[PDB]
């Protein structure tokens, strides 16, 4: 286990045996792919192979090393104000819980229909000094599940978190990180969906009727400062203890908007990664 796990030799690939010639009836190279199945032909079948003892692990080819990597999924921003502190909808951020709001990683999952996981979660606040001294800028992140009082503005009554989670980070002390159970009323997170809100010819349809899972109302606790700032707290996410069901063809068209598939670009012709050739004859 150790060795196999430390040496990373858990999932090893078979070796390529030796072959000889075959002047025989059954032709393994011939199958009818229309059966929708996949061929089973190998080196040893087609050629006069040798003998290679392999030693490549398919460890890094596991839904956990494919998925289990932290990725920017949101960049909370706060261009503070000292003029009006508090006021409605200010100096505090709130953002709807999701992934589709930012590619590369959105891409990655979407490779599967259903998914399930405990999520890591890390916050990377970066304090840009627009003043001659930033002081001590404390911070409060927290999580507002449904249906819950989402701060109208900066000091509601909801920042008491008498029964909510609020993580606090003060300049110097390291990056806040924490983790989370798999939050869904369903046995798995719906990466997709072919359902709607209802029969209302104006109902919602997508990944989304099934994912109202939160939001995040933010706060820079410290009170009024002299010299201004702007805070940019980056939100990274990692999938630990993941499972996946029914793979899908990757995405080749740059999306737009989340919780939707829509590609149809604003005017520009739909572009894809495929390159053009002069002729099939020369590559």
């Amino acid at each position: 286990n150790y060795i196999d796990e430390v040496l990373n030799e858990v999932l090893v690939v078979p070796n390529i045996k030796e072959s000889h010639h075959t002047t025989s009836n059954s032709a393994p190279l011939l199958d009818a792919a229309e059966t929708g199945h996949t061929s089973n032909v190998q080196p040893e079948d087609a050629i006069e192979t040798r003998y290679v003892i392999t030693s490549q692990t398919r460890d890094e080819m596991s839904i956990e090393s494919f998925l289990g990597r932290s990725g920017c999924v949101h960049i909370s921003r706060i261009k503070v104000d000292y003029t009006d502190y508090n006021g409605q909808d200010i100096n505090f951020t709130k953002w709807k819980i999701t992934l589709q709001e930012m590619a590369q990683i959105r891409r990655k999952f979407e490779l599967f229909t259903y998914v399930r996981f405990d999520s890591e979660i890390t916050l990377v606040p970066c304090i840009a000094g627009r003043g001659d001294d930033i002081g001590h800028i404390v911070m409060q992140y927290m999580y507002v599940p449904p249906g819950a009082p989402i701060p109208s503005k900066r000091n509601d009554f909801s920042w008491q978190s008498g029964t909510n989670m609020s993580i606090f980070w003060q300049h110097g002390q390291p990056f806040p990180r924490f983790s989370i159970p798999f939050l869904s009323i369903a046995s798995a997170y719906y990466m997709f969906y072919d359902g709607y809100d209802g029969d209302n010819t104006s109902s919602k349809y997508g990944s989304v009727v099934t994912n109202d899972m939160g939001t995040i109302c933010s706060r820079i606790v410290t009170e009024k400062q002299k010299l201004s700032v702007v805070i940019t707290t980056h939100i990274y996410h990692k999938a630990k203890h993941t499972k996946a069901w029914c793979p899908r063809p990757p995405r080749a068209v740059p999306y737009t908007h989340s919780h939707v598939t829509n590609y149809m670009p604003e005017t520009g012709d739909v572009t894809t990664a495929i390159v053009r050739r002069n002729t099939i004859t020369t590559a």
Binding site: E5, V10, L11, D59, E64, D118, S179, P181, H241
Partner: peptide, 19 residues
């Protein structure tokens, strides 16, 4: 060094294993 789930909950733990 391992299996020392310093934290109570299971959701908090390292990347799972392989089998």
């Amino acid at each position: 060094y391992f299996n020392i789930n310093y934290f109570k909950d299971a959701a908090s733990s390292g990347a799972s294993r392989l089998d």
